Amino acid sequence: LGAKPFGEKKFIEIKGRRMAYIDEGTGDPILFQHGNPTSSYLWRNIMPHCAGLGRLIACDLIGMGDSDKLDPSGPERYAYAEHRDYLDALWEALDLGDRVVLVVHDWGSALGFDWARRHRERVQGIAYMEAIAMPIEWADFPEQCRDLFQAFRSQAGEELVLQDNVFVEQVLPGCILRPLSEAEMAAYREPFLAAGEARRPTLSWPRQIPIAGTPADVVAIARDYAGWLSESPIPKLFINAEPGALTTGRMRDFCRTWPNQTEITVAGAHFIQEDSPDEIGAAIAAFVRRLRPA
Template identity: 40%
Template structure:
Protein backbone atom coordinates (compact mmCIF):
# COMPACT_ATOMS: atom_id res chain seq x y z
CA UNK A 1 0.00 0.00 0.00
CA UNK A 2 1.05 3.61 -0.53
CA UNK A 3 0.18 6.71 1.51
CA UNK A 4 1.04 10.39 1.02
CA UNK A 5 3.21 11.89 3.75
CA UNK A 6 4.96 15.27 3.92
CA UNK A 7 4.71 15.88 0.19
CA UNK A 8 6.05 12.45 -0.72
CA UNK A 9 4.86 8.88 -0.23
CA UNK A 10 5.59 5.85 1.93
CA UNK A 11 5.00 2.30 0.79
CA UNK A 12 4.04 -0.28 3.41
CA UNK A 13 2.84 -3.84 3.80
CA UNK A 14 -0.34 -4.17 5.85
CA UNK A 15 -2.19 -7.32 6.89
CA UNK A 16 -4.47 -8.50 9.68
CA UNK A 17 -6.47 -6.53 12.25
CA UNK A 18 -5.85 -5.61 15.87
CA UNK A 19 -2.78 -4.49 17.78
CA UNK A 20 -0.33 -2.84 15.34
CA UNK A 21 3.01 -4.64 15.09
CA UNK A 22 5.33 -2.34 13.12
CA UNK A 23 8.42 -3.88 11.52
CA UNK A 24 11.21 -1.39 10.69
CA UNK A 25 14.00 -2.36 8.32
CA UNK A 26 17.57 -1.12 8.13
CA UNK A 27 20.20 -0.32 5.50
CA UNK A 28 20.36 -1.14 2.58
CA UNK A 29 17.03 -2.93 2.83
CA UNK A 30 13.27 -2.50 2.61
CA UNK A 31 10.10 -4.07 3.93
CA UNK A 32 11.02 -7.07 1.75
CA UNK A 33 13.38 -8.24 4.49
CA UNK A 34 10.33 -9.20 6.59
CA UNK A 35 8.66 -11.37 3.91
CA UNK A 36 9.59 -14.65 5.64
CA UNK A 37 9.09 -13.32 9.19
CA UNK A 38 5.59 -11.84 9.02
CA UNK A 39 3.76 -15.15 8.36
CA UNK A 40 5.20 -16.57 11.59
CA UNK A 41 4.06 -13.58 13.65
CA UNK A 42 0.58 -13.35 12.12
CA UNK A 43 -2.22 -14.22 14.57
CA UNK A 44 -5.78 -13.17 15.34
CA UNK A 45 -5.80 -9.73 16.97
CA UNK A 46 -2.58 -8.55 15.30
CA UNK A 47 -2.16 -6.07 12.49
CA UNK A 48 1.26 -6.41 10.85
CA UNK A 49 2.74 -3.36 9.14
CA UNK A 50 6.14 -2.99 7.47
CA UNK A 51 6.97 0.37 5.85
CA UNK A 52 9.76 1.20 3.45
CA UNK A 53 11.75 4.08 4.95
CA UNK A 54 11.68 7.32 2.98
CA UNK A 55 14.05 7.13 0.01
CA UNK A 56 14.21 3.34 0.27
CA UNK A 57 12.37 0.42 -1.28
CA UNK A 58 9.19 1.54 -3.03
CA UNK A 59 8.78 4.72 -0.98
CA UNK A 60 9.22 8.18 -2.49
CA UNK A 61 12.67 9.64 -2.97
CA UNK A 62 12.37 13.37 -2.25
CA UNK A 63 15.34 15.72 -2.22
CA UNK A 64 16.50 15.29 1.39
CA UNK A 65 19.80 14.99 3.27
CA UNK A 66 18.48 11.61 4.56
CA UNK A 67 19.81 12.17 8.04
CA UNK A 68 18.45 10.19 10.99
CA UNK A 69 16.07 13.04 11.82
CA UNK A 70 14.62 13.01 8.29
CA UNK A 71 13.75 9.34 8.57
CA UNK A 72 12.23 9.84 12.01
CA UNK A 73 10.14 12.76 10.77
CA UNK A 74 8.66 10.79 7.88
CA UNK A 75 7.99 7.80 10.13
CA UNK A 76 6.20 10.06 12.60
CA UNK A 77 4.04 11.39 9.78
CA UNK A 78 3.26 7.83 8.64
CA UNK A 79 2.23 6.79 12.18
CA UNK A 80 0.02 9.86 12.41
CA UNK A 81 -1.53 9.36 8.96
CA UNK A 82 -2.54 5.81 9.86
CA UNK A 83 -3.60 6.74 13.40
CA UNK A 84 -1.39 4.06 14.93
CA UNK A 85 -1.45 3.81 18.74
CA UNK A 86 -0.49 1.15 21.31
CA UNK A 87 2.03 -0.32 18.89
CA UNK A 88 4.59 -3.09 19.20
CA UNK A 89 7.79 -2.11 17.41
CA UNK A 90 10.19 -4.61 15.83
CA UNK A 91 13.45 -3.18 14.54
CA UNK A 92 16.57 -4.41 12.78
CA UNK A 93 19.72 -2.38 12.06
CA UNK A 94 18.72 1.31 11.71
CA UNK A 95 15.10 0.22 12.07
CA UNK A 96 15.88 -0.70 15.68
CA UNK A 97 17.48 2.69 16.36
CA UNK A 98 14.44 4.41 14.81
CA UNK A 99 12.15 2.24 16.96
CA UNK A 100 13.97 3.30 20.15
CA UNK A 101 13.90 6.93 19.06
CA UNK A 102 10.17 6.80 18.30
CA UNK A 103 9.40 5.11 21.62
CA UNK A 104 11.50 7.63 23.56
CA UNK A 105 9.66 10.55 21.96
CA UNK A 106 6.19 8.93 22.10
CA UNK A 107 6.31 6.80 25.26
CA UNK A 108 2.54 6.47 25.53
CA UNK A 109 2.26 5.06 22.03
CA UNK A 110 4.45 1.95 22.46
CA UNK A 111 3.46 -1.33 24.14
CA UNK A 112 6.61 -3.32 23.46
CA UNK A 113 9.87 -3.30 21.48
CA UNK A 114 11.70 -6.25 19.94
CA UNK A 115 15.09 -5.68 18.32
CA UNK A 116 18.16 -7.35 16.90
CA UNK A 117 21.40 -6.41 15.15
CA UNK A 118 20.85 -2.74 15.84
CA UNK A 119 22.47 0.27 17.49
CA UNK A 120 21.73 0.43 21.21
CA UNK A 121 24.54 2.81 22.21
CA UNK A 122 27.46 4.75 20.81
CA UNK A 123 30.36 2.54 19.71
CA UNK A 124 34.08 3.07 19.46
CA UNK A 125 36.16 2.22 16.42
CA UNK A 126 38.05 -0.27 18.59
CA UNK A 127 34.86 -2.26 19.19
CA UNK A 128 34.46 -3.00 15.50
CA UNK A 129 35.99 -6.13 14.06
CA UNK A 130 38.84 -5.72 11.60
CA UNK A 131 36.74 -6.19 8.46
CA UNK A 132 33.82 -3.94 9.59
CA UNK A 133 36.33 -1.30 10.67
CA UNK A 134 38.00 -1.30 7.24
CA UNK A 135 34.61 -1.15 5.52
CA UNK A 136 33.38 1.75 7.68
CA UNK A 137 36.62 3.69 7.17
CA UNK A 138 36.42 3.23 3.40
CA UNK A 139 32.79 4.37 3.21
CA UNK A 140 33.45 7.42 5.41
CA UNK A 141 36.61 8.27 3.46
CA UNK A 142 37.10 10.17 0.21
CA UNK A 143 36.42 7.07 -1.90
CA UNK A 144 33.13 6.35 -0.11
CA UNK A 145 30.90 8.20 -2.56
CA UNK A 146 32.29 6.34 -5.54
CA UNK A 147 32.18 3.02 -3.68
CA UNK A 148 28.49 3.33 -2.76
CA UNK A 149 26.98 5.63 -5.39
CA UNK A 150 28.60 4.34 -8.57
CA UNK A 151 27.37 0.75 -8.32
CA UNK A 152 25.49 -1.83 -6.31
CA UNK A 153 28.34 -2.67 -3.93
CA UNK A 154 26.46 -1.86 -0.73
CA UNK A 155 23.33 -3.86 -1.47
CA UNK A 156 25.15 -6.75 -3.08
CA UNK A 157 27.72 -7.08 -0.29
CA UNK A 158 25.00 -6.92 2.38
CA UNK A 159 23.20 -9.93 0.98
CA UNK A 160 26.22 -11.96 -0.04
CA UNK A 161 28.66 -11.13 2.78
CA UNK A 162 26.28 -10.05 5.55
CA UNK A 163 24.44 -13.37 5.56
CA UNK A 164 25.60 -16.93 6.13
CA UNK A 165 23.89 -18.13 2.96
CA UNK A 166 24.47 -15.64 0.10
CA UNK A 167 21.40 -14.73 -1.92
CA UNK A 168 21.25 -15.70 -5.59
CA UNK A 169 20.49 -13.22 -8.34
CA UNK A 170 16.72 -13.85 -8.31
CA UNK A 171 16.50 -13.08 -4.59
CA UNK A 172 18.90 -10.15 -4.87
CA UNK A 173 16.99 -8.44 -7.67
CA UNK A 174 14.14 -6.99 -5.53
CA UNK A 175 16.72 -5.50 -3.15
CA UNK A 176 18.67 -3.96 -6.06
CA UNK A 177 15.79 -2.60 -8.13
CA UNK A 178 14.97 0.45 -5.93
CA UNK A 179 18.51 1.81 -6.47
CA UNK A 180 19.21 1.97 -10.23
CA UNK A 181 21.00 5.34 -10.26
CA UNK A 182 23.65 7.30 -8.42
CA UNK A 183 21.12 9.65 -6.83
CA UNK A 184 18.81 6.82 -5.74
CA UNK A 185 21.67 5.38 -3.66
CA UNK A 186 22.29 8.52 -1.59
CA UNK A 187 20.11 7.34 1.33
CA UNK A 188 22.22 4.18 1.50
CA UNK A 189 25.45 6.18 1.66
CA UNK A 190 24.09 8.50 4.36
CA UNK A 191 23.00 5.58 6.53
CA UNK A 192 26.34 3.85 6.02
CA UNK A 193 28.14 6.98 7.24
CA UNK A 194 25.84 7.53 10.23
CA UNK A 195 26.94 4.87 12.72
CA UNK A 196 27.76 6.70 15.99
CA UNK A 197 31.47 6.07 16.39
CA UNK A 198 33.54 7.97 18.96
CA UNK A 199 31.20 10.97 18.97
CA UNK A 200 30.64 11.24 15.22
CA UNK A 201 28.22 12.12 13.67
CA UNK A 202 27.07 14.37 16.51
CA UNK A 203 23.37 14.44 15.57
CA UNK A 204 23.11 10.64 15.62
CA UNK A 205 25.11 10.39 18.85
CA UNK A 206 22.61 12.80 20.43
CA UNK A 207 19.59 10.80 19.24
CA UNK A 208 21.08 7.51 20.41
CA UNK A 209 21.94 8.96 23.82
CA UNK A 210 18.34 10.18 24.19
CA UNK A 211 16.99 6.73 23.28
CA UNK A 212 19.41 5.04 25.66
CA UNK A 213 17.85 6.90 28.59
CA UNK A 214 14.42 5.60 27.59
CA UNK A 215 15.73 2.05 27.22
CA UNK A 216 17.15 2.22 30.74
CA UNK A 217 14.08 3.69 32.39
CA UNK A 218 10.99 2.33 30.62
CA UNK A 219 10.42 -0.67 32.87
CA UNK A 220 6.73 -0.75 31.98
CA UNK A 221 7.50 -1.61 28.34
CA UNK A 222 8.63 -5.21 27.69
CA UNK A 223 11.64 -5.51 25.43
CA UNK A 224 13.09 -8.44 23.51
CA UNK A 225 16.66 -8.78 22.24
CA UNK A 226 17.38 -11.50 19.69
CA UNK A 227 20.99 -12.63 19.43
CA UNK A 228 22.91 -14.77 16.94
CA UNK A 229 26.36 -16.28 16.57
CA UNK A 230 29.20 -17.42 14.30
CA UNK A 231 29.29 -14.49 11.83
CA UNK A 232 32.01 -11.79 11.88
CA UNK A 233 29.43 -9.29 10.59
CA UNK A 234 27.33 -9.33 13.76
CA UNK A 235 26.70 -5.95 15.41
CA UNK A 236 25.31 -7.33 18.69
CA UNK A 237 28.36 -9.12 20.03
CA UNK A 238 28.37 -10.99 23.36
CA UNK A 239 29.82 -7.85 24.97
CA UNK A 240 27.02 -5.65 23.60
CA UNK A 241 24.39 -8.22 24.61
CA UNK A 242 25.83 -8.22 28.14
CA UNK A 243 25.66 -4.41 28.16
CA UNK A 244 21.99 -4.62 27.14
CA UNK A 245 21.25 -7.08 29.94
CA UNK A 246 22.66 -4.62 32.46
CA UNK A 247 21.30 -1.38 30.99
CA UNK A 248 17.96 -2.08 29.24
CA UNK A 249 14.94 -2.24 31.54
CA UNK A 250 12.45 -5.12 31.27
CA UNK A 251 14.66 -6.96 28.79
CA UNK A 252 14.43 -10.58 27.74
CA UNK A 253 17.11 -12.11 25.51
CA UNK A 254 16.51 -15.06 23.17
CA UNK A 255 19.33 -16.67 21.21
CA UNK A 256 18.31 -17.68 17.70
CA UNK A 257 21.40 -19.53 16.47
CA UNK A 258 23.84 -18.87 13.61
CA UNK A 259 23.17 -15.89 11.36
CA UNK A 260 24.82 -12.93 9.70
CA UNK A 261 23.95 -9.30 10.34
CA UNK A 262 21.01 -9.48 7.92
CA UNK A 263 19.55 -12.24 10.04
CA UNK A 264 16.05 -12.20 8.54
CA UNK A 265 17.55 -13.98 5.53
CA UNK A 266 19.26 -16.67 7.63
CA UNK A 267 16.80 -17.26 10.49
CA UNK A 268 13.34 -15.90 9.61
CA UNK A 269 11.47 -18.76 11.29
CA UNK A 270 13.42 -18.50 14.52
CA UNK A 271 12.98 -14.72 14.60
CA UNK A 272 9.24 -15.01 14.04
CA UNK A 273 8.83 -17.73 16.66
CA UNK A 274 10.73 -15.73 19.28
CA UNK A 275 8.69 -12.57 18.64
CA UNK A 276 5.42 -14.50 18.65
CA UNK A 277 6.20 -16.29 21.92
CA UNK A 278 7.37 -13.05 23.62
CA UNK A 279 4.26 -11.20 22.49
CA UNK A 280 2.02 -13.98 23.83
CA UNK A 281 3.84 -14.02 27.19
CA UNK A 282 3.14 -10.33 27.63
CA UNK A 283 -0.33 -10.24 26.13
CA UNK A 284 0.77 -7.83 23.41
Protein backbone atom coordinates (compact mmCIF):
# COMPACT_ATOMS: atom_id res chain seq x y z
CA LEU A 1 0.00 0.00 0.00
CA GLY A 2 2.46 2.83 -1.02
CA ALA A 3 2.14 6.40 -2.54
CA LYS A 4 4.76 6.35 -5.29
CA PRO A 5 3.60 6.01 -8.90
CA PHE A 6 4.59 2.97 -10.87
CA GLY A 7 6.85 3.12 -13.96
CA GLU A 8 7.75 6.05 -16.22
CA LYS A 9 5.08 8.08 -18.04
CA LYS A 10 5.22 7.93 -21.81
CA PHE A 11 3.31 9.99 -24.32
CA ILE A 12 1.70 9.42 -27.75
CA GLU A 13 0.01 12.03 -29.92
CA ILE A 14 -3.60 11.15 -30.64
CA LYS A 15 -5.81 13.38 -32.83
CA GLY A 16 -3.82 16.47 -31.85
CA ARG A 17 -3.71 15.77 -28.11
CA ARG A 18 -0.94 14.22 -26.10
CA MET A 19 -2.01 11.09 -24.18
CA ALA A 20 -0.04 9.74 -21.23
CA TYR A 21 0.45 6.12 -20.30
CA ILE A 22 2.67 3.68 -18.46
CA ASP A 23 4.22 0.80 -20.53
CA GLU A 24 6.72 -1.22 -18.49
CA GLY A 25 8.43 -4.45 -19.29
CA THR A 26 8.13 -6.78 -22.17
CA GLY A 27 5.81 -9.44 -23.54
CA ASP A 28 2.07 -9.67 -24.32
CA PRO A 29 0.08 -6.83 -22.77
CA ILE A 30 -1.65 -6.67 -19.43
CA LEU A 31 -3.74 -3.57 -19.92
CA PHE A 32 -5.03 -1.82 -16.80
CA GLN A 33 -7.78 0.78 -17.41
CA HIS A 34 -8.98 3.22 -14.77
CA GLY A 35 -12.34 5.00 -14.70
CA ASN A 36 -13.73 8.10 -12.98
CA PRO A 37 -12.25 10.19 -11.35
CA THR A 38 -8.94 8.32 -11.35
CA SER A 39 -5.93 7.74 -13.60
CA SER A 40 -3.14 5.19 -14.17
CA TYR A 41 -2.18 6.04 -10.53
CA LEU A 42 -5.05 3.80 -9.37
CA TRP A 43 -3.06 0.73 -10.35
CA ARG A 44 0.34 1.65 -8.95
CA ASN A 45 0.35 -0.99 -6.16
CA ILE A 46 -1.26 -3.65 -8.35
CA MET A 47 0.78 -3.60 -11.58
CA PRO A 48 4.05 -4.65 -9.79
CA HIS A 49 2.44 -7.99 -8.97
CA CYS A 50 2.59 -8.81 -12.71
CA ALA A 51 6.30 -8.00 -13.14
CA GLY A 52 7.87 -10.16 -15.86
CA LEU A 53 4.49 -11.58 -16.99
CA GLY A 54 4.00 -9.11 -19.84
CA ARG A 55 3.97 -5.51 -20.94
CA LEU A 56 2.37 -3.63 -18.05
CA ILE A 57 0.27 -0.88 -19.55
CA ALA A 58 -1.94 1.76 -17.95
CA CYS A 59 -3.37 4.60 -20.02
CA ASP A 60 -4.71 7.94 -18.78
CA LEU A 61 -8.08 8.65 -20.41
CA ILE A 62 -8.36 11.89 -22.37
CA GLY A 63 -8.76 14.88 -20.09
CA MET A 64 -7.63 12.72 -17.11
CA GLY A 65 -4.32 11.99 -15.47
CA ASP A 66 -1.53 13.52 -17.52
CA SER A 67 -3.41 13.28 -20.80
CA ASP A 68 -4.31 16.60 -22.41
CA LYS A 69 -7.58 18.41 -21.86
CA LEU A 70 -10.04 18.89 -24.74
CA ASP A 71 -10.86 22.50 -25.62
CA PRO A 72 -13.62 23.52 -26.36
CA SER A 73 -15.26 21.82 -23.43
CA GLY A 74 -18.85 21.96 -22.17
CA PRO A 75 -21.74 19.64 -21.39
CA GLU A 76 -21.34 17.84 -24.77
CA ARG A 77 -17.64 17.04 -24.15
CA TYR A 78 -16.07 13.86 -22.72
CA ALA A 79 -19.05 11.54 -23.43
CA TYR A 80 -18.42 7.82 -23.68
CA ALA A 81 -18.19 7.83 -27.48
CA GLU A 82 -15.49 10.51 -27.42
CA HIS A 83 -13.44 8.71 -24.79
CA ARG A 84 -13.73 5.52 -26.88
CA ASP A 85 -12.50 7.38 -30.00
CA TYR A 86 -9.34 8.55 -28.21
CA LEU A 87 -8.71 5.30 -26.34
CA ASP A 88 -9.29 3.08 -29.43
CA ALA A 89 -6.69 5.16 -31.26
CA LEU A 90 -4.15 5.00 -28.40
CA TRP A 91 -4.63 1.23 -28.05
CA GLU A 92 -4.07 0.85 -31.80
CA ALA A 93 -0.95 3.00 -31.54
CA LEU A 94 0.46 0.81 -28.75
CA ASP A 95 0.71 -2.28 -31.09
CA LEU A 96 -0.85 -4.63 -28.55
CA GLY A 97 -1.12 -7.83 -30.67
CA ASP A 98 -3.65 -10.54 -30.08
CA ARG A 99 -3.10 -11.83 -26.47
CA VAL A 100 -4.29 -8.87 -24.42
CA VAL A 101 -5.28 -9.39 -20.78
CA LEU A 102 -7.64 -6.57 -19.77
CA VAL A 103 -7.80 -5.42 -16.16
CA VAL A 104 -10.67 -2.97 -15.74
CA HIS A 105 -12.53 -0.85 -13.21
CA ASP A 106 -15.63 1.47 -13.39
CA TRP A 107 -15.72 3.26 -16.79
CA GLY A 108 -12.54 1.38 -17.70
CA SER A 109 -14.75 -1.72 -17.69
CA ALA A 110 -17.36 -0.14 -19.99
CA LEU A 111 -14.60 0.91 -22.39
CA GLY A 112 -12.66 -2.35 -22.10
CA PHE A 113 -15.71 -4.66 -22.34
CA ASP A 114 -16.85 -2.86 -25.49
CA TRP A 115 -13.34 -3.01 -27.05
CA ALA A 116 -13.17 -6.71 -26.25
CA ARG A 117 -16.58 -7.34 -27.88
CA ARG A 118 -15.28 -5.61 -31.01
CA HIS A 119 -11.88 -7.42 -30.93
CA ARG A 120 -12.69 -10.73 -29.34
CA GLU A 121 -9.94 -12.78 -30.98
CA ARG A 122 -7.38 -10.39 -29.47
CA VAL A 123 -8.41 -10.82 -25.82
CA GLN A 124 -6.73 -13.59 -23.84
CA GLY A 125 -8.50 -12.81 -20.52
CA ILE A 126 -10.54 -10.21 -18.71
CA ALA A 127 -10.13 -9.31 -15.03
CA TYR A 128 -12.79 -6.89 -13.77
CA MET A 129 -13.91 -5.30 -10.54
CA GLU A 130 -16.60 -2.75 -9.53
CA ALA A 131 -17.65 -2.68 -13.15
CA ILE A 132 -20.56 -1.46 -15.20
CA ALA A 133 -21.55 -4.92 -16.42
CA MET A 134 -25.03 -4.05 -17.69
CA PRO A 135 -27.58 -1.21 -17.84
CA ILE A 136 -29.05 -0.57 -14.44
CA GLU A 137 -32.00 0.99 -12.57
CA TRP A 138 -31.69 3.45 -9.68
CA ALA A 139 -32.67 0.70 -7.25
CA ASP A 140 -29.32 -1.01 -8.23
CA PHE A 141 -27.32 2.02 -7.44
CA PRO A 142 -25.76 2.23 -3.98
CA GLU A 143 -28.20 3.87 -1.61
CA GLN A 144 -25.52 5.87 0.09
CA CYS A 145 -24.89 7.83 -3.12
CA ARG A 146 -28.11 7.70 -5.19
CA ASP A 147 -29.13 11.29 -4.55
CA LEU A 148 -25.72 12.71 -5.31
CA PHE A 149 -25.43 10.83 -8.60
CA GLN A 150 -28.94 11.93 -9.55
CA ALA A 151 -27.76 15.44 -8.78
CA PHE A 152 -24.64 15.09 -10.95
CA ARG A 153 -26.95 14.10 -13.83
CA SER A 154 -29.11 17.17 -13.26
CA GLN A 155 -28.15 20.75 -13.91
CA ALA A 156 -26.81 20.80 -10.30
CA GLY A 157 -23.79 18.91 -11.61
CA GLU A 158 -21.94 21.99 -12.94
CA GLU A 159 -21.79 23.63 -9.50
CA LEU A 160 -21.18 20.41 -7.57
CA VAL A 161 -18.34 19.21 -9.82
CA LEU A 162 -16.93 22.10 -11.84
CA GLN A 163 -17.05 24.57 -8.98
CA ASP A 164 -16.87 22.38 -5.86
CA ASN A 165 -15.04 19.34 -7.26
CA VAL A 166 -17.17 16.95 -5.20
CA PHE A 167 -16.44 13.80 -7.20
CA VAL A 168 -12.74 14.12 -6.43
CA GLU A 169 -13.00 15.69 -2.99
CA GLN A 170 -15.85 13.69 -1.56
CA VAL A 171 -17.01 10.66 -3.64
CA LEU A 172 -13.52 9.25 -4.18
CA PRO A 173 -12.27 9.26 -0.50
CA GLY A 174 -15.77 8.34 0.73
CA CYS A 175 -15.67 5.14 -1.40
CA ILE A 176 -12.28 4.09 -0.05
CA LEU A 177 -12.38 2.35 3.34
CA ARG A 178 -9.02 3.60 4.61
CA PRO A 179 -7.90 7.28 4.88
CA LEU A 180 -5.57 8.46 2.12
CA SER A 181 -2.29 10.31 2.77
CA GLU A 182 -1.96 13.83 1.40
CA ALA A 183 0.37 12.62 -1.35
CA GLU A 184 -2.15 10.00 -2.50
CA MET A 185 -5.01 12.50 -2.46
CA ALA A 186 -2.79 15.02 -4.24
CA ALA A 187 -2.11 12.53 -7.04
CA TYR A 188 -5.87 12.10 -7.54
CA ARG A 189 -6.56 15.83 -7.26
CA GLU A 190 -3.78 16.86 -9.62
CA PRO A 191 -5.62 16.66 -13.00
CA PHE A 192 -8.64 18.41 -11.54
CA LEU A 193 -7.14 21.13 -9.40
CA ALA A 194 -8.57 23.94 -11.57
CA ALA A 195 -12.17 25.02 -11.31
CA GLY A 196 -14.21 24.91 -14.53
CA GLU A 197 -13.81 22.75 -17.61
CA ALA A 198 -10.64 21.01 -16.37
CA ARG A 199 -13.03 19.07 -14.15
CA ARG A 200 -15.57 18.33 -16.91
CA PRO A 201 -14.50 14.62 -17.33
CA THR A 202 -15.53 13.92 -13.74
CA LEU A 203 -19.04 15.39 -14.44
CA SER A 204 -19.54 13.99 -17.93
CA TRP A 205 -18.81 10.46 -16.68
CA PRO A 206 -21.73 10.16 -14.18
CA ARG A 207 -23.98 11.59 -16.90
CA GLN A 208 -23.02 8.60 -19.11
CA ILE A 209 -23.97 5.83 -16.65
CA PRO A 210 -26.71 3.71 -18.25
CA ILE A 211 -29.51 4.11 -15.68
CA ALA A 212 -33.28 3.69 -16.31
CA GLY A 213 -32.71 3.75 -20.04
CA THR A 214 -30.64 6.92 -20.42
CA PRO A 215 -28.47 7.99 -22.02
CA ALA A 216 -29.76 5.64 -24.69
CA ASP A 217 -26.49 5.36 -26.61
CA VAL A 218 -24.54 4.05 -23.63
CA VAL A 219 -27.42 1.81 -22.62
CA ALA A 220 -27.27 0.16 -26.04
CA ILE A 221 -23.49 -0.26 -25.77
CA ALA A 222 -23.70 -1.89 -22.34
CA ARG A 223 -26.65 -4.04 -23.45
CA ASP A 224 -24.44 -5.33 -26.25
CA TYR A 225 -21.38 -6.10 -24.14
CA ALA A 226 -23.51 -7.67 -21.37
CA GLY A 227 -25.10 -10.11 -23.77
CA TRP A 228 -21.76 -10.91 -25.31
CA LEU A 229 -19.85 -11.40 -22.01
CA SER A 230 -22.54 -13.68 -20.59
CA GLU A 231 -21.90 -16.17 -23.41
CA SER A 232 -18.20 -15.53 -24.13
CA PRO A 233 -15.76 -18.41 -23.54
CA ILE A 234 -12.87 -15.97 -22.85
CA PRO A 235 -11.26 -16.58 -19.45
CA LYS A 236 -12.48 -14.15 -16.78
CA LEU A 237 -11.41 -13.13 -13.28
CA PHE A 238 -14.09 -11.47 -11.19
CA ILE A 239 -12.60 -9.49 -8.32
CA ASN A 240 -15.60 -9.08 -6.05
CA ALA A 241 -15.60 -6.68 -3.09
CA GLU A 242 -17.08 -6.53 0.37
CA PRO A 243 -18.97 -4.42 0.94
CA GLY A 244 -18.60 -3.31 -2.67
CA ALA A 245 -20.60 -0.51 -4.23
CA LEU A 246 -21.53 -0.99 -7.83
CA THR A 247 -21.04 -4.73 -8.35
CA THR A 248 -23.45 -5.92 -5.72
CA GLY A 249 -27.00 -7.23 -5.62
CA ARG A 250 -28.47 -8.28 -9.00
CA MET A 251 -25.48 -7.09 -11.04
CA ARG A 252 -23.16 -9.21 -8.96
CA ASP A 253 -25.54 -12.18 -9.41
CA PHE A 254 -25.42 -11.51 -13.18
CA CYS A 255 -21.66 -11.41 -13.33
CA ARG A 256 -21.53 -14.68 -11.41
CA THR A 257 -23.25 -16.42 -14.30
CA TRP A 258 -20.46 -15.56 -16.78
CA PRO A 259 -18.59 -18.57 -18.23
CA ASN A 260 -14.97 -19.55 -17.72
CA GLN A 261 -14.68 -17.38 -14.63
CA THR A 262 -12.68 -17.53 -11.44
CA GLU A 263 -13.51 -15.28 -8.47
CA ILE A 264 -11.87 -13.74 -5.43
CA THR A 265 -13.40 -11.32 -2.88
CA VAL A 266 -11.40 -8.47 -1.31
CA ALA A 267 -12.13 -5.73 1.17
CA GLY A 268 -13.27 -2.46 -0.41
CA ALA A 269 -16.16 -0.26 -1.46
CA HIS A 270 -15.79 1.14 -5.00
CA PHE A 271 -12.07 2.17 -5.35
CA ILE A 272 -11.01 -1.18 -3.96
CA GLN A 273 -7.48 -0.79 -5.38
CA GLU A 274 -6.71 1.55 -2.47
CA ASP A 275 -7.89 -0.93 0.18
CA SER A 276 -6.62 -4.29 -1.03
CA PRO A 277 -4.01 -3.79 -3.79
CA ASP A 278 -1.83 -6.76 -2.89
CA GLU A 279 -4.72 -9.24 -2.84
CA ILE A 280 -6.00 -7.89 -6.14
CA GLY A 281 -2.52 -7.95 -7.63
CA ALA A 282 -1.90 -11.52 -6.46
CA ALA A 283 -5.16 -12.71 -7.98
CA ILE A 284 -4.38 -11.08 -11.31
CA ALA A 285 -0.84 -12.50 -11.40
CA ALA A 286 -2.13 -16.01 -10.71
CA PHE A 287 -4.74 -15.61 -13.49
CA VAL A 288 -2.08 -14.47 -15.97
CA ARG A 289 0.24 -17.27 -14.86
CA ARG A 290 -2.47 -19.73 -15.76
CA LEU A 291 -3.13 -18.11 -19.11
CA ARG A 292 0.63 -17.86 -19.92
CA PRO A 293 2.15 -21.05 -18.56
CA ALA A 294 5.87 -20.91 -18.04
